[PDB]
């Protein structure tokens, strides 16, 4: 009833640990950091300090003020060094920098955000090979609390969250529906599905109107409201309701560092064999 | 109710015939067969033929026996030559000849058939450019006959069909189901969409439990049987209840020829600018 993702995060992790010791792989991983946001940064030091205990070489390089030019240089120079398994760019950017056309130079077998046009095609074309983080962080959830061959809706329909994560689920046989600001009815689609996938960062969104008894809730939002930090549903509320229950924090966060080096990994790994 | 796709493939063809006059492109597809496929044939000579009409070269490359390492080199000469904008192979093919794996070969902007990786990516990131022909043939029947920002429940979950149109119906501000054959109960889903699209391949599967008087039921089945041919749905029952619907043949079948040809001018205005 509670789902809790820091033990998953360890099993991962230690699952990880286990494949780069009996396999002698040494993945790296590069970040590159655009400005000085907090979120951003506690994402990045979580990536090299997890790293660290599995054993991934992971790199930040923070930049004040970069230009394009210089910025799609040194992703060229990392994209061609073999020593270099995975690369990452951190969000948000400033203001013109386009995040899905930087990206783009980043060979898709470096690309460990998985959000690259190519990644996103093959996850699509059931042939995943690297995942988004939070998509993967969602199924982690079902996988190890026993959620199979359910309907899902999806509040969300960005290309971080609810698009790669649908095509993700019906990958695994889940039955999808994916929602958004402009559905006219979304209480009427996530009363009728088993899961409840939401990501639309506003705090207390799904409230009990919108769930069943039955319902299995996983909250991805995640709200600053009186410095404190809040997902998207009202936990308090469902947690006496509904079947079982994200928190926020301790849900799917823990996992998502994790799941960006799961990436490098089999990067490294593909690298391994294919180059 | 009858939501025919004929005057949506004229009226296609005129506006393609018009975007080549004002931009001077000569574009042309290659074609390539590899077999004795009747459908396969009928559907590249629809492309010869309006591709003729509308100023497309397009061009057919038969084989008996092609080897997958020629095979290999020819999309790759065809790939480097500028003058190709269009690489399409037909399907189906010789067996454990891996279609998504050749097309991955093809550069993304010749890409017409648009299912290969990056294509399918850049629909999944809503940034459409190639898209594939049966997806787009449901969104240009939904267009002309009214029916914009809807709930719709796709029954099928193929990287040909529902895979690339759950993608282009979000894109598109659509609220979209997805189901298949490990879907417990298909009808509640489709029951409660205003429109239901159905390729399951299966005559008589989508029947009068399934859908309502306000249902919009478009059909993408292609069936053979009495070598009579039908759709998925049951037509001639569902015609008299529900508020609209194809009709197989004659629905989305006759616009798919004309969106590869649509990617194919696509395919050309980009490799001018590049
Ligand atoms: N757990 C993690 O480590 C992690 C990782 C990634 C993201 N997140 C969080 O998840 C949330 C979304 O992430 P994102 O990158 O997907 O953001 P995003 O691009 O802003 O997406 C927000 C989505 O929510 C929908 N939405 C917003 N308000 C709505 C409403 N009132 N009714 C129905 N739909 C509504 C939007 O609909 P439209 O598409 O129509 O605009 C959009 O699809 C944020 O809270 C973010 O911080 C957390
Ligand atoms: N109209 C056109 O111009 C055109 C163009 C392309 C395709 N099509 C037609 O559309 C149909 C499907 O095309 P495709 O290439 O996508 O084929 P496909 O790859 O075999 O897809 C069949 C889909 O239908 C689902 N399905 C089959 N039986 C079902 C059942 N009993 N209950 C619920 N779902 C069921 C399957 O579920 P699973 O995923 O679980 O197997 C699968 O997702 C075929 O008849 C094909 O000829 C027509």
Redo the contacts between chains.
């Keep these: 009833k509670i789902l809790r993702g820091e033990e998953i995060a360890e099993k991962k992790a230690e699952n990880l640990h286990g494949i780069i010791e009996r396999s002698g792989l040494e993945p790296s991983l590069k970040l590159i950091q655009i400005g000085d946001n907090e979120a951003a940064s506690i994402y990045a030091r979580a990536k090299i300090r997890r790293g660290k205990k599995i054993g991934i070489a992971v790199d930040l390089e923070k930049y004040d003020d970069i230009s394009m030019k210089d910025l799609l240089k040194r992703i060229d120079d990392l994209a061609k060094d073999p020593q270099i398994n995975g690369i990452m760019i951190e969000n948000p950017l400033p203001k013109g920098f386009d995040y ?1 056309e930087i990206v783009r130079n980043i060979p898709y077998y470096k690309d460990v955000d998985a959000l ?12 995943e090979f690297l995942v988004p983080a939070t998509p993967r962080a969602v199924i982690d959830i079902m996988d190890y609390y026993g959620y199979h ?1 359910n ?1 899902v809706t999806i509040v969300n ?1 960005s ?1 971080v969250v609810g ?2 994560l ?2 993700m689920l ?1 990958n695994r ?1 889940y ?6 600001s ?3 009815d979304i209480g ?2 996530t009363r ?1 599905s088993k899961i409840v996938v939401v990501a639309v960062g506003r705090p207390g969104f799904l409230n009990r109107e919108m769930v069943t008894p039955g319902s299995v809730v996983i909250d991805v939002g995640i709200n600053y409201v009186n410095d404190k930090v809040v997902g998207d549903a009202n936990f308090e509320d469902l947690s006496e309701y509904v079947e079982a229950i994200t928190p926020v924090p301790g849900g799917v966060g823990p996992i998502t560092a994790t799941n960006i080096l799961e990436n490098v990994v089999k990067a490294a790994e593909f690298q391994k064999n294919n180059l």
């Design positions: 899905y690259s046009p190519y990644n996103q095609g093959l996850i699509a074309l059931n042939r061959e309907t329909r290309p698009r790669p649908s095509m019906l046989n039955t999808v529906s994916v929602c958004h402009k559905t006219k009427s689609m009728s």
